[PDB]
Amino acid sequence: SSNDNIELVDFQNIMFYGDAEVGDNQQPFTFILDTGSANLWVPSVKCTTAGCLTKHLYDSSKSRTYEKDGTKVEMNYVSGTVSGFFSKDLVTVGNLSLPYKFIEVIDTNGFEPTYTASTFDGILGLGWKDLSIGSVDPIVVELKNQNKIENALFTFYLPVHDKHTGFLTIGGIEERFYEGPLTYEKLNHDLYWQITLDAHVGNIMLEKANCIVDSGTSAITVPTDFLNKMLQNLDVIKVPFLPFYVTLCNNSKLPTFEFTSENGKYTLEPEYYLQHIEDVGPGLCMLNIIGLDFPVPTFILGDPFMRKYFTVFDYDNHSVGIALAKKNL
Amino acid sequence: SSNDNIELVDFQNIMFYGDAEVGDNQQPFTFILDTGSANLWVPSVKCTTAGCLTKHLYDSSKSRTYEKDGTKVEMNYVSGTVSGFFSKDLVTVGNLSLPYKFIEVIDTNGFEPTYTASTFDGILGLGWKDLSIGSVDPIVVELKNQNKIENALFTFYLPVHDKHTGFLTIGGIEERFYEGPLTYEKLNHDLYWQITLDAHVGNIMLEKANCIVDSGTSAITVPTDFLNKMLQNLDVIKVPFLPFYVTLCNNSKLPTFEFTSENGKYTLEPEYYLQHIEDVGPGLCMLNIIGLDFPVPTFILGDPFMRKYFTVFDYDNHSVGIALAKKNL
Ligand SMILES: CC(C)CC(=O)N[C@H](C(=O)N[C@H](C(=O)N[C@H]([C@@H](O)CC(=O)N[C@@H](C)C(=O)N[C@H]([C@@H](O)CC(=O)O)C(F)(F)F)C(F)(F)F)C(C)C)C(C)C
Ligand SMILES: CC(C)CC(=O)N[C@H](C(=O)N[C@H](C(=O)N[C@H]([C@@H](O)CC(=O)N[C@@H](C)C(=O)N[C@H]([C@@H](O)CC(=O)O)C(F)(F)F)C(F)(F)F)C(C)C)C(C)C
């Protein structure tokens, strides 16, 4: 190697996390690393929520390179909201560093009960500037301007529970991570890491669908009506009030996602997308396919897809690369 | 009986619905009758959206009493968004009826998957005027200002699946529904049906807590910090990123909720917030409790609560009245 590797820890085969620093001193945080968004936020010390009370908090008066701003910003996701103000300081990943504009968080109730339940401290976006709030040029794009990295690109090799850890690599592609050919798909918009793919599952086919590839989503997301058509030939239990379903993890009538383009064929078997709930019953699983409508019919290939597919995110080449991940490092 | 009833139909143990009709012909619909909002809306015959396929729709043309208006609106719900424009025409509930301004919806896409998954057509608000978009007097206030019922008040007797249907009554109180004394709590505000009660659960006590009585909230809603302290040592399982809490139905460690004031004490014991999930696993139950945070600490006493307690909603005397519902009519 000769690149910047940031190690990834598994949560349960559902999420993954990875650490970075802020400020010139230590000040360590646990992050959701998120191609899904394009802001960095961090829990402040001025924060008196029940939530922050369990987290590693951030101290702006104990870092020599702080730089006040205090502009109020509401940061919203599909899963919730988070509030506070802007600030600037030295963000440090792997062993690379830069001055950066990030968000200091004072309200977290919009993201509960998930925040207090989970081990992460904050969320480090990895999208494009048009997706950012307050036009912040992505870290990786800036580490190229400061000729700190070879390429304006980053790479995701995700951990599997009883096999290996994973890495986020900045600057270049490493062969150790994948086996087989990489396939590059072009972005249809410089917003989300979004590419165009025929999605089909048994008979249900959706040609030329928007596909956002998102490190900070624990499910596969599916147009709301698409899920209904799929549900029609399954035999799963509905969870009374919620849009969630339960199956045996060995139900053979479970579908494989097939996404195809001019360049590649990527499939996602049940054994990657199911969410194991051993502690509720033996061999019992959440379907972990979620109904979610956008303006455009859209599929979020999230964590489960990324557990099987090693992926390259290329700013220079406006593209996403996709290959089979190595079963073992 | 002296006042008008509307029969309440049990929606698969989950929700309940009632029928009201719109226009000078009948044109019936199925509404969620809902103390937590204060607009009436009904899907248009002019509707373009997929959701509307399975629904009763409203035809201006077929009704003499229609009155053009057409100001664009957007109704917003913790659970989604629904869009259209206003119209005035003849709302009828049971068989009291009045010219009433309401929303003709034409886009339901922000209301999925709930709208296609459920079998209601509209929502009928029963909260207060300030809750409404466009400053609309509640139906039951107008019905009274126009002298069609004795008191500006409505009552709720929820169905129980295996046992009885339910009734929304308008204008009077009916002895046949409750048992023992009514007790009345002034609202703390004329917005939601919101009173102040002391919430006590384990050794966790929240004092002077805002409580919303919401016949359209399928669960009981607790502050996220309170609910997180609450689960703590009970043998419950929060499924990692879901509001999905599972236990043994006999978990003899499960607390009774206890709300109190000068006048009364309201308990809701495990048998009231537990939904049987036999199909998932033998002897298993889920806790019908959400963790939600408003700007001020709040509880929402939704359907679970109202399944135990007959509730009286009095605009005249600005209060909620609570007495134990009859086991069987
Ligand atoms: C999927 C559930 C069954 C389990 C669960 O809830 N998992 C959560 C989840 O995956 N949530 C996803 C999510 O919000 N991910 C988040 C992002 O990766 C995507 C994002 O929302 N990005 C923001 C920037 C977004 O698009 N927000 C938009 C707008 O603010 C922006 C706009 O429209 O331009 C939104 F708020 F949804 F409206 C994460 F990671 F939380 F930060 C969701 C299913 C997409 C995780 C604990 C986070
Ligand atoms: C959450 C699980 C229990 C499953 C679930 O989805 N349950 C549903 C439910 O209870 N949803 C609740 C809800 O949205 N109830 C709804 C109302 O009772 C309250 C309301 O949203 N009121 C509005 C008026 C409100 O507070 N809006 C505000 C503002 O926009 C103010 C504004 O402009 O009106 C909000 F959207 F929250 F932001 C119902 F019925 F859909 F109408 C939710 C748990 C709070 C039902 C099975 C359909």
Swiss-Prot record, chains A, B:
GO molecular function: aspartic-type endopeptidase activity
Sequence ranges on the Lumenal membrane side: 1-329
Cellular localization per UniProt: Membrane; Vacuole lumen; Vacuole membrane
Main location, first listed in the record: membrane
Keywords, comma-separated and alphabetical: Aspartyl protease, Disulfide bond, Hydrolase, Membrane, Protease, Signal-anchor, Transmembrane, Transmembrane helix, Vacuole, Zymogen
Summary of the function given for this chain in its UniProt record: During the asexual blood stage, participates in initial cleavage of native host hemoglobin (Hb) resulting in Hb denaturation. May cleave preferentially denatured hemoglobin that has been cleaved by PMI. Digestion of host Hb is an essential step which provides the parasite with amino acids for protein synthesis, and regulates osmolarity.
Subunit structure comment from the entry: Component of the hemozoin formation complex (HFC) composed of falcipains FP2A and/or FP2B, plasmepsins PMII, PMIII/HAP and PMIV, heme detoxifying protein HDP and falcilysin FLN. The HFC complex is involved in hemoglobin degradation and detoxification of heme in the food vacuole during the asexual blood stage.
Protein family according to the UniProt entry: Belongs to the peptidase A1 family.
Protein name as annotated: Plasmepsin II
Originating organism: Plasmodium falciparum (isolate HB3)
First-to-last residue of the parent protein present: 125 to 453 of 453
